Amino acid sequence: GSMQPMLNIALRAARSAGELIFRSIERLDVISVNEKDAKDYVTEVDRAAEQTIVAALRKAYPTHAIMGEEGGLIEGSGEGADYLWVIDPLDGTTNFIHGVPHFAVSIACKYKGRLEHAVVLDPVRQEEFTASRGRGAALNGRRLRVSGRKSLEGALLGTGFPFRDNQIDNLDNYLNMFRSLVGQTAGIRRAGAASLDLAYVAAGRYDAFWEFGLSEWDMAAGALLVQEAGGLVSDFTGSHEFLEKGHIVAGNTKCFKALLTTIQPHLPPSLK
Amino acid sequence: GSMQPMLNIALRAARSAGELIFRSIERLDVISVNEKDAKDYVTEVDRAAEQTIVAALRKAYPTHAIMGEEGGLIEGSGEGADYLWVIDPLDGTTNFIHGVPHFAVSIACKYKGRLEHAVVLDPVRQEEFTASRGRGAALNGRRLRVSGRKSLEGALLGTGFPFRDNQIDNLDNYLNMFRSLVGQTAGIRRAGAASLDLAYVAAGRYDAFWEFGLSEWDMAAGALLVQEAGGLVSDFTGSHEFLEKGHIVAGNTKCFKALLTTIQPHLPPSLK
């Protein structure tokens, strides 16, 4: 398809970031990564990839606002102030630092607060998920559709737990959700990168996905992918503030609805 | 080059099987999967990959015994009767049928019941894990080591829940196991192919792994990979009958010991 210029800029920026990340991982597989130096090696790769993305974006749009995982939020100016790029230069950091080849670059563009363009790029598998509002979604140029599955029977769901200490008090809640889904589904997967879980919803590889504790840069692009593939995205209450609240349900039509209903009785008032 | 001829035969057979499976997934992502036809399409692809592997093996060793996931157990003759090939032609069947690009061919060779050769091949990522007894393990020719991590602090563990009706009754123990691991670890992953989880333990990508409900062809090759990379493998009671019993713990030295210890209080009454 003929992509809008902004989507093409984001895609080329993701490609450069992903190639940098790929070279980085290749050296880190052949060397011992001390665990005291591991978090600093990760900070390095994040910031170098973020620099790559932001440099490419600002070469084309110097007046746009940028919100990066590493750099925070920097406002735009003039008309460009209505554009906000939401960047995770490396989604899946625990996988990356352990050498697990499942992670992605995630770039979204919001126009006046609504999702307008999205890229999720797997640089290992060379899988480029792209979308623009009203243009559909694609994997390496091919149109994407959510799966047709009519219920949770035999469904393949994605999920992921937030592993940091301040979510420990939610474990039973999560484990309750999980508990109630094991009977109906064919499987539940925790692969460790929410942007690729959403991308997989968009491509029909997962029938639905849910998670809490996420940040905006992990979910923004993938949510647009799911929407443009004909799916649904909400927070745990069925409203559209998933980006701000950190909990998200995405899926095809019927499996989104069923998954939302299923998880309702286990929601803490914290996540309501 | 450095490989013994028997290991090279197994590796070439795995490559051919993997190319067949890869072409298959490519046709099934762009076409509708009825789901009435899903079990028949997977059976078709399994049997074609198994035929590919078995034809390659028997062209070199016609008197060896063969045990395929699709096919039965067929004994050998003469000295060759002491050799048994243990084949899962396509590990990760739920992933495969949904288009999730994470699955592998698994081929092990046992000599008088002891693991002698092993191949786990990821045809999407083109990752060839090979090992021979007393020869070490390799990823695409590069020698492999288990990670050096000394405890579960910050560890990345793999596991799989078993989804069948006949394991539903073990779920609570599992969710208990999971609970006791959430505080210390950086993550737990359920990617959906036990052979690649074991391969990732061998390569240092996971620090440890546990799962029950597996079949021999799921575990055999990956178990040799972990052993030859310097790790430890046992069943849930610490003995070496994981292949017959279907439950397995694998890991680097200290994380293997800690994970086995952690899961002892959660064993269902069968296991003491």
Side-chain angles (χ1 to χ4, degrees):
Chain A
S2 44
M3 308 188 335
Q4 280 170 266
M6 257 195 220
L7 172 65
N8 175 70
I9 294 295
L11 175 59
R12 284 139 40 143
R15 284 179 179 149
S16 304
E19 177 64 29
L20 180 140
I21 295 150
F22 185 71
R23 309 188 324 245
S24 168
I25 188 97
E26 293 201 297
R27 315 174 208 57
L28 164 157
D29 287 329
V30 313
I31 71 85
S32 265
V33 177
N34 296 3
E35 300 119 355
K36 84 210 209 149
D37 296 344
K39 182 214 68 160
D40 288 328
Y41 190 60
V42 166
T43 296
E44 223 200 65
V45 181
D46 272 295
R47 288 187 188 180
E50 182 149 313
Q51 190 276 332
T52 302
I53 296 163
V54 169
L57 294 177
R58 299 209 64 219
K59 182 196 204 208
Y61 310 101
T63 68
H64 286 190
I66 306 193
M67 191 216 156
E69 186 255 345
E70 298 293 303
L73 175 57
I74 314 276
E75 57 248 73
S77 69
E79 280 137 274
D82 294 321
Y83 292 96
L84 174 63
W85 294 90
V86 179
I87 307 159
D88 189 346
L90 177 45
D91 182 40
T93 349
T94 296
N95 284 357
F96 173 86
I97 201 45
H98 284 258
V100 174
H102 184 85
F103 48 79
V105 184
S106 187
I107 302 172
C109 184
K110 295 207 286 212
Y111 175 73
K112 287 197 194 166
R114 187 199 32 189
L115 297 174
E116 189 69 30
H117 306 284
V119 177
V120 176
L121 194 140
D122 177 340
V124 170
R125 271 169 193 116
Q126 314 250 76
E127 293 200 316
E128 322 188 320
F129 304 88
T130 52
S132 281
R133 177 172 59 98
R135 303 302 193 87
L139 165 56
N140 298 346
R142 144 153 92 91
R143 170 152 238 183
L144 291 187
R145 210 65 193 145
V146 293
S147 77
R149 189 174 238 105
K150 297 281 108 206
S151 76
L152 297 184
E153 282 303 332
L156 184 65
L157 310 190
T159 191
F161 196 68
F163 261 91
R164 67 256 191 182
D165 162 343
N166 56 44
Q167 230 74 29
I168 189 58
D169 318 87
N170 295 344
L171 205 34
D172 287 61
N173 292 114
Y174 178 85
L175 289 182
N176 278 340
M177 291 169 158
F178 187 100
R179 326 257 191 121
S180 61
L181 292 166
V182 167
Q184 339 189 42
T185 62
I188 308 176
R189 300 288 180 269
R190 200 155 330 102
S195 69
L196 284 173
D197 294 323
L198 292 162
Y200 283 17
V201 171
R205 309 181 159 167
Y206 293 160
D207 304 304
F209 164 82
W210 90 107
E211 175 164 17
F212 62 82
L214 289 172
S215 296
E216 191 161 2
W217 37 82
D218 300 325
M219 28 174 171
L224 186 60
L225 295 173
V226 173
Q227 289 165 356
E228 285 305 311
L232 298 166
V233 186
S234 77
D235 57 45
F236 281 4
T237 80
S239 146
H240 292 141
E241 325 166 336
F242 43 107
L243 291 188
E244 299 84 9
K245 275 148 173 48
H247 42 98
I248 191 177
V249 188
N252 82 5
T253 310
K254 309 240 206 134
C255 289
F256 164 89
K257 152 170 84 205
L259 179 52
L260 187 63
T261 303
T262 295
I263 72 155
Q264 291 314 343
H266 314 114
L267 294 192
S270 149
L271 293 164
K272 232 187 241 187
Chain B
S2 88
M3 306 185 334
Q4 313 171 235
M6 194 150 319
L7 172 66
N8 175 247
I9 294 294
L11 175 59
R12 284 138 45 144
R15 284 178 179 148
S16 304
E19 264 292 301
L20 181 141
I21 295 149
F22 184 71
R23 308 189 152 137
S24 213
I25 188 145
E26 293 198 304
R27 319 191 289 277
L28 169 162
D29 286 329
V30 314
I31 48 82
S32 149
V33 177
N34 213 281
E35 176 75 357
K36 249 302 297 204
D37 296 327
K39 183 102 217 63
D40 288 328
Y41 197 46
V42 284
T43 296
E44 188 164 286
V45 180
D46 272 348
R47 289 187 188 180
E50 183 149 318
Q51 191 277 333
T52 302
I53 295 163
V54 169
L57 294 177
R58 299 209 63 219
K59 183 189 159 229
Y61 311 105
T63 67
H64 286 190
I66 305 207
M67 144 173 285
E69 188 268 343
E70 297 285 328
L73 172 57
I74 314 276
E75 291 300 340
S77 70
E79 97 164 29
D82 294 334
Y83 292 86
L84 174 63
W85 293 90
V86 179
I87 307 159
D88 191 347
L90 180 180
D91 182 40
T93 278
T94 295
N95 284 358
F96 173 85
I97 202 45
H98 284 258
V100 175
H102 185 85
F103 48 79
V105 184
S106 186
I107 302 172
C109 184
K110 296 214 285 212
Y111 175 74
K112 287 201 206 166
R114 151 201 101 190
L115 298 174
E116 190 70 30
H117 306 284
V119 178
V120 176
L121 195 140
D122 177 341
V124 168
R125 271 170 195 117
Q126 313 250 75
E127 293 200 316
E128 323 189 321
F129 303 88
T130 52
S132 281
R133 177 169 162 99
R135 305 303 193 88
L139 165 57
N140 299 347
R142 151 147 82 88
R143 172 144 203 119
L144 291 187
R145 256 313 209 201
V146 293
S147 77
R149 188 174 232 103
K150 295 155 149 43
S151 76
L152 297 184
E153 284 303 331
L156 184 65
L157 309 189
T159 191
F161 188 76
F163 263 87
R164 345 163 295 298
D165 294 288
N166 55 45
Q167 307 265 340
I168 187 174
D169 280 340
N170 295 345
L171 161 87
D172 288 7
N173 291 68
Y174 179 86
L175 289 182
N176 278 339
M177 294 171 337
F178 188 85
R179 277 156 188 266
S180 61
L181 293 165
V182 167
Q184 271 191 308
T185 61
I188 308 176
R189 299 287 130 97
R190 201 190 324 273
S195 69
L196 284 172
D197 294 324
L198 292 163
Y200 284 17
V201 170
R205 310 182 160 168
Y206 293 161
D207 304 305
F209 165 83
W210 90 106
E211 175 163 17
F212 62 91
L214 289 172
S215 297
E216 190 161 2
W217 37 82
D218 301 326
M219 303 172 271
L224 186 60
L225 296 173
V226 173
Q227 290 165 356
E228 284 304 311
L232 297 166
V233 187
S234 77
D235 58 46
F236 282 4
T237 81
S239 186
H240 291 140
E241 325 163 50
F242 43 89
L243 291 188
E244 302 85 290
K245 277 156 171 273
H247 42 98
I248 192 176
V249 188
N252 83 5
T253 311
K254 307 175 107 321
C255 289
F256 164 89
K257 287 128 74 129
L259 180 52
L260 187 62
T261 302
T262 296
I263 70 101
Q264 292 316 125
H266 314 282
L267 294 192
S270 346
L271 311 155
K272 318 159 301 209

Coordinates of all heavy atoms in Angstrom, one line a residue, chain A residues 154-207:
Chain A
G154 N -11.2 -22.8 22.6 CA -10.0 -23.0 21.8 C -9.2 -21.8 21.5 O -8.3 -21.9 20.7
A155 N -9.6 -20.7 22.2 CA -8.9 -19.4 21.9 C -7.4 -19.5 22.4 O -7.1 -20.2 23.3 CB -9.7 -18.3 22.5
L156 N -6.6 -18.7 21.8 CA -5.2 -18.4 22.2 C -5.1 -17.0 22.7 O -5.4 -16.1 21.9 CB -4.2 -18.7 21.1 CG -2.7 -18.6 21.5 CD1 -2.2 -19.6 22.5 CD2 -1.8 -18.7 20.2
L157 N -5.0 -16.8 24.0 CA -4.9 -15.5 24.6 C -3.4 -15.1 24.9 O -2.6 -15.9 25.2 CB -5.7 -15.4 25.9 CG -7.1 -15.9 25.8 CD1 -7.8 -15.6 27.2 CD2 -7.8 -15.3 24.6
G158 N -3.1 -13.8 24.8 CA -1.9 -13.2 25.4 C -2.1 -12.5 26.7 O -3.2 -12.0 27.0
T159 N -1.0 -12.5 27.5 CA -1.1 -11.8 28.8 C 0.3 -11.5 29.3 O 1.3 -12.0 28.7 CB -1.9 -12.6 29.8 OG1 -2.2 -11.8 31.0 CG2 -1.1 -13.8 30.2
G160 N 0.5 -10.6 30.3 CA 1.7 -10.5 31.0 C 1.7 -9.9 32.4 O 0.9 -9.0 32.6
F161 N 2.3 -10.5 33.4 CA 2.3 -9.9 34.7 C 3.3 -8.8 34.9 O 4.4 -8.9 34.4 CB 2.5 -10.9 35.8 CG 2.1 -10.5 37.1 CD1 0.8 -10.3 37.4 CD2 3.0 -10.3 38.1 CE1 0.4 -9.8 38.7 CE2 2.7 -9.9 39.4 CZ 1.3 -9.6 39.7
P162 N 3.0 -7.7 35.6 CA 4.1 -6.7 35.9 C 4.9 -7.2 37.1 O 4.3 -7.4 38.2 CB 3.3 -5.4 36.3 CG 2.0 -5.9 36.8 CD 1.7 -7.3 36.2
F163 N 6.2 -7.3 36.9 CA 7.0 -8.1 37.9 C 7.5 -7.3 39.0 O 8.1 -7.9 39.9 CB 8.1 -8.9 37.2 CG 7.6 -10.3 37.0 CD1 7.0 -10.8 35.8 CD2 7.8 -11.3 38.0 CE1 6.6 -12.1 35.7 CE2 7.5 -12.6 37.9 CZ 6.8 -13.0 36.7
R164 N 7.4 -5.9 39.0 CA 8.0 -5.1 40.0 C 7.2 -5.3 41.3 O 6.0 -5.6 41.3 CB 8.0 -3.7 39.6 CG 6.7 -3.0 39.4 CD 6.3 -2.9 37.9 NE 5.1 -2.1 37.8 CZ 4.6 -1.8 36.6 NH1 5.0 -2.4 35.5 NH2 3.5 -1.0 36.5
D165 N 7.8 -4.9 42.4 CA 7.2 -5.0 43.8 C 5.9 -4.2 43.9 O 5.0 -4.8 44.5 CB 8.3 -4.5 44.7 CG 7.8 -4.0 46.1 OD1 6.6 -3.8 46.3 OD2 8.6 -3.9 47.1
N166 N 5.8 -3.0 43.4 CA 4.5 -2.3 43.7 C 3.2 -3.0 43.0 O 2.1 -2.4 43.2 CB 4.5 -0.8 43.3 CG 4.8 -0.5 41.9 OD1 4.4 -1.2 41.0 ND2 5.6 0.5 41.7
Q167 N 3.3 -4.1 42.3 CA 2.2 -4.8 41.8 C 1.9 -6.1 42.6 O 0.9 -6.9 42.2 CB 2.2 -5.0 40.3 CG 0.9 -4.6 39.6 CD 0.7 -3.0 39.5 OE1 1.6 -2.3 39.4 NE2 -0.6 -2.6 39.4
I168 N 2.7 -6.5 43.6 CA 2.7 -7.8 44.2 C 1.3 -8.1 44.9 O 0.7 -9.2 44.7 CB 3.9 -7.9 45.3 CG1 4.1 -9.3 45.8 CG2 3.4 -7.0 46.5 CD1 4.4 -10.5 44.7
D169 N 0.7 -7.0 45.4 CA -0.6 -7.0 46.1 C -1.8 -7.2 45.1 O -2.9 -7.3 45.6 CB -0.9 -5.6 46.8 CG 0.3 -5.0 47.5 OD1 1.1 -4.3 46.9 OD2 0.4 -5.2 48.8
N170 N -1.5 -7.3 43.8 CA -2.5 -7.6 42.8 C -2.4 -9.0 42.3 O -3.2 -9.5 41.5 CB -2.4 -6.6 41.6 CG -2.8 -5.2 42.1 OD1 -3.4 -5.0 43.1 ND2 -2.4 -4.2 41.3
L171 N -1.4 -9.8 42.7 CA -1.1 -11.1 42.2 C -2.4 -12.0 42.3 O -2.7 -12.6 41.3 CB 0.0 -11.8 43.0 CG 0.8 -12.9 42.4 CD1 1.1 -12.8 40.9 CD2 2.1 -13.2 43.3
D172 N -3.0 -12.1 43.4 CA -4.2 -13.0 43.5 C -5.2 -12.5 42.5 O -5.8 -13.4 41.8 CB -4.7 -13.0 44.9 CG -3.9 -13.8 45.9 OD1 -2.7 -13.4 46.0 OD2 -4.3 -14.9 46.4
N173 N -5.5 -11.2 42.4 CA -6.4 -10.7 41.4 C -6.0 -11.3 40.0 O -6.8 -11.9 39.3 CB -6.4 -9.2 41.4 CG -7.0 -8.7 42.7 OD1 -6.3 -8.0 43.5 ND2 -8.3 -8.9 42.8
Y174 N -4.7 -11.1 39.6 CA -4.3 -11.6 38.3 C -4.5 -13.1 38.3 O -5.1 -13.6 37.3 CB -2.9 -11.3 38.1 CG -2.4 -11.8 36.8 CD1 -2.6 -11.2 35.6 CD2 -1.7 -13.1 36.8 CE1 -2.2 -11.7 34.4 CE2 -1.3 -13.6 35.6 CZ -1.5 -13.0 34.4 OH -1.0 -13.5 33.2
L175 N -4.1 -13.8 39.3 CA -4.1 -15.3 39.3 C -5.6 -15.7 39.3 O -5.9 -16.8 38.8 CB -3.4 -15.9 40.4 CG -1.9 -15.7 40.3 CD1 -1.1 -16.4 41.4 CD2 -1.4 -16.3 38.9
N176 N -6.5 -14.9 39.8 CA -7.9 -15.2 39.6 C -8.4 -15.1 38.2 O -9.0 -16.1 37.7 CB -8.7 -14.3 40.5 CG -8.8 -14.7 42.0 OD1 -8.5 -15.8 42.3 ND2 -9.1 -13.8 42.9
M177 N -8.0 -14.0 37.5 CA -8.3 -13.9 36.1 C -7.8 -15.1 35.3 O -8.6 -15.9 34.7 CB -7.7 -12.6 35.6 CG -8.4 -11.4 36.1 SD -7.5 -10.0 35.8 CE -8.8 -8.8 35.9
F178 N -6.5 -15.4 35.4 CA -5.9 -16.5 34.8 C -6.8 -17.8 35.1 O -7.1 -18.6 34.2 CB -4.4 -16.7 35.2 CG -3.7 -17.8 34.4 CD1 -2.9 -17.5 33.3 CD2 -3.8 -19.1 34.9 CE1 -2.2 -18.6 32.7 CE2 -3.1 -20.1 34.3 CZ -2.3 -19.9 33.2
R179 N -7.1 -17.9 36.4 CA -7.8 -19.2 36.8 C -9.0 -19.4 36.0 O -9.1 -20.4 35.3 CB -8.4 -19.1 38.2 CG -7.7 -18.2 39.2 CD -6.9 -19.4 40.1 NE -6.2 -19.2 41.3 CZ -6.5 -19.7 42.5 NH1 -7.5 -20.6 42.6 NH2 -5.8 -19.4 43.6
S180 N -9.8 -18.4 35.9 CA -11.1 -18.5 35.2 C -11.0 -18.6 33.7 O -12.0 -19.0 33.1 CB -12.0 -17.2 35.5 OG -11.3 -16.0 35.0
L181 N -9.8 -18.4 33.1 CA -9.7 -18.6 31.7 C -9.1 -19.9 31.3 O -9.2 -20.3 30.1 CB -8.9 -17.5 31.1 CG -9.5 -16.1 31.1 CD1 -8.4 -15.0 30.8 CD2 -10.6 -15.9 30.1
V182 N -8.6 -20.7 32.2 CA -7.9 -21.9 31.8 C -8.9 -23.0 31.2 O -8.5 -23.7 30.2 CB -7.0 -22.5 32.9 CG1 -6.5 -23.9 32.6 CG2 -5.9 -21.6 33.1
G183 N -10.1 -23.0 31.7 CA -11.0 -24.1 31.3 C -11.4 -23.9 29.8 O -11.4 -24.9 29.0
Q184 N -11.8 -22.7 29.4 CA -12.3 -22.5 28.0 C -11.2 -22.5 27.0 O -11.4 -23.0 25.9 CB -13.1 -21.2 28.0 CG -13.6 -20.7 29.4 CD -14.5 -19.6 29.3 OE1 -15.4 -19.5 28.4 NE2 -14.3 -18.6 30.2
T185 N -10.1 -21.8 27.3 CA -9.1 -21.5 26.2 C -8.2 -22.7 25.8 O -8.1 -23.7 26.6 CB -8.2 -20.4 26.7 OG1 -7.5 -20.8 27.9 CG2 -9.0 -19.1 27.1
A186 N -7.7 -22.6 24.6 CA -6.7 -23.6 24.2 C -5.3 -23.3 24.7 O -4.4 -24.1 24.8 CB -6.6 -23.6 22.7
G187 N -5.1 -22.0 25.1 CA -3.8 -21.6 25.7 C -3.8 -20.2 26.1 O -4.5 -19.3 25.5
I188 N -2.9 -19.9 27.0 CA -2.5 -18.5 27.4 C -1.0 -18.4 27.3 O -0.3 -19.3 27.7 CB -3.0 -18.2 28.8 CG1 -4.5 -18.5 28.9 CG2 -2.8 -16.8 29.1 CD1 -5.2 -18.4 30.2
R189 N -0.5 -17.3 26.8 CA 0.9 -17.1 26.5 C 1.3 -15.8 27.2 O 0.5 -14.8 27.3 CB 1.2 -16.9 25.0 CG 0.9 -18.2 24.2 CD 1.8 -19.3 24.5 NE 1.5 -20.5 23.7 CZ 0.7 -21.5 24.1 NH1 0.1 -21.5 25.3 NH2 0.5 -22.6 23.3
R190 N 2.5 -15.9 27.8 CA 3.2 -14.8 28.4 C 4.6 -14.7 27.8 O 5.5 -15.4 28.2 CB 3.4 -15.0 29.9 CG 3.6 -13.7 30.7 CD 3.2 -13.7 32.2 NE 2.1 -14.5 32.5 CZ 2.1 -15.7 33.1 NH1 3.3 -16.3 33.4 NH2 1.0 -16.4 33.3
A191 N 4.7 -14.0 26.7 CA 5.9 -13.9 25.9 C 6.8 -12.7 26.3 O 8.0 -12.8 26.0 CB 5.6 -13.9 24.4
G192 N 6.3 -11.7 26.9 CA 7.1 -10.6 27.5 C 7.2 -9.3 26.7 O 8.1 -8.5 27.1
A193 N 6.4 -9.1 25.7 CA 6.3 -7.8 25.1 C 4.9 -7.4 24.6 O 4.4 -8.0 23.7 CB 7.3 -7.8 23.9
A194 N 4.3 -6.5 25.3 CA 2.9 -6.1 25.1 C 2.7 -5.6 23.7 O 1.6 -5.8 23.1 CB 2.5 -5.1 26.2
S195 N 3.6 -4.8 23.2 CA 3.4 -4.3 21.8 C 3.3 -5.4 20.8 O 2.4 -5.4 19.9 CB 4.5 -3.3 21.4 OG 5.8 -4.0 21.2
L196 N 4.1 -6.5 20.9 CA 3.9 -7.6 20.0 C 2.7 -8.5 20.3 O 2.1 -9.0 19.4 CB 5.2 -8.5 20.1 CG 6.4 -7.9 19.3 CD1 7.6 -8.7 19.5 CD2 6.0 -7.9 17.8
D197 N 2.3 -8.5 21.6 CA 1.0 -9.2 21.9 C -0.2 -8.5 21.2 O -1.1 -9.1 20.6 CB 0.8 -9.2 23.4 CG 1.8 -10.1 24.2 OD1 2.2 -11.2 23.6 OD2 2.3 -9.7 25.3
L198 N -0.2 -7.1 21.3 CA -1.2 -6.4 20.6 C -1.1 -6.6 19.1 O -2.1 -6.8 18.3 CB -1.2 -4.9 20.9 CG -1.6 -4.6 22.4 CD1 -1.0 -3.2 22.8 CD2 -3.1 -4.7 22.5
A199 N 0.2 -6.5 18.5 CA 0.4 -6.8 17.1 C -0.1 -8.1 16.7 O -0.7 -8.3 15.6 CB 1.9 -6.6 16.8
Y200 N 0.0 -9.1 17.6 CA -0.5 -10.5 17.3 C -2.0 -10.5 17.3 O -2.6 -11.3 16.5 CB 0.1 -11.4 18.3 CG 1.6 -11.8 18.0 CD1 2.4 -11.0 17.2 CD2 2.1 -12.9 18.6 CE1 3.7 -11.3 17.0 CE2 3.4 -13.3 18.4 CZ 4.2 -12.5 17.6 OH 5.5 -12.8 17.3
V201 N -2.6 -9.8 18.2 CA -4.1 -9.6 18.1 C -4.5 -9.1 16.8 O -5.4 -9.6 16.1 CB -4.6 -8.7 19.3 CG1 -6.1 -8.4 19.1 CG2 -4.3 -9.4 20.6
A202 N -3.8 -8.0 16.3 CA -4.1 -7.4 15.1 C -3.9 -8.3 13.9 O -4.8 -8.4 13.0 CB -3.2 -6.1 14.8
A203 N -2.9 -9.2 13.9 CA -2.7 -10.1 12.8 C -3.5 -11.4 12.9 O -3.4 -12.2 12.0 CB -1.2 -10.4 12.8
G204 N -4.3 -11.6 13.9 CA -5.0 -12.8 14.1 C -4.3 -13.9 14.8 O -4.8 -15.1 14.8
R205 N -3.1 -13.7 15.3 CA -2.3 -14.8 15.9 C -2.8 -15.0 17.3 O -2.6 -16.2 17.8 CB -0.8 -14.4 15.9 CG -0.4 -14.0 14.5 CD 1.1 -13.7 14.5 NE 1.8 -13.8 13.2 CZ 3.0 -13.4 13.0 NH1 3.7 -12.8 13.9 NH2 3.5 -13.6 11.8
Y206 N -3.2 -14.0 18.1 CA -4.0 -14.2 19.3 C -5.4 -13.8 19.1 O -5.7 -12.8 18.3 CB -3.4 -13.3 20.4 CG -2.1 -13.6 20.9 CD1 -1.4 -12.6 21.6 CD2 -1.5 -14.8 20.7 CE1 -0.1 -12.9 22.0 CE2 -0.2 -15.1 21.1 CZ 0.4 -14.1 21.8 OH 1.7 -14.3 22.3
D207 N -6.3 -14.4 19.8 CA -7.7 -14.0 19.7 C -8.1 -12.9 20.6 O -9.0 -12.1 20.3 CB -8.6 -15.2 20.0 CG -8.3 -16.3 19.0 OD1 -8.3 -16.1 17.8 OD2 -8.0 -17.4 19.5

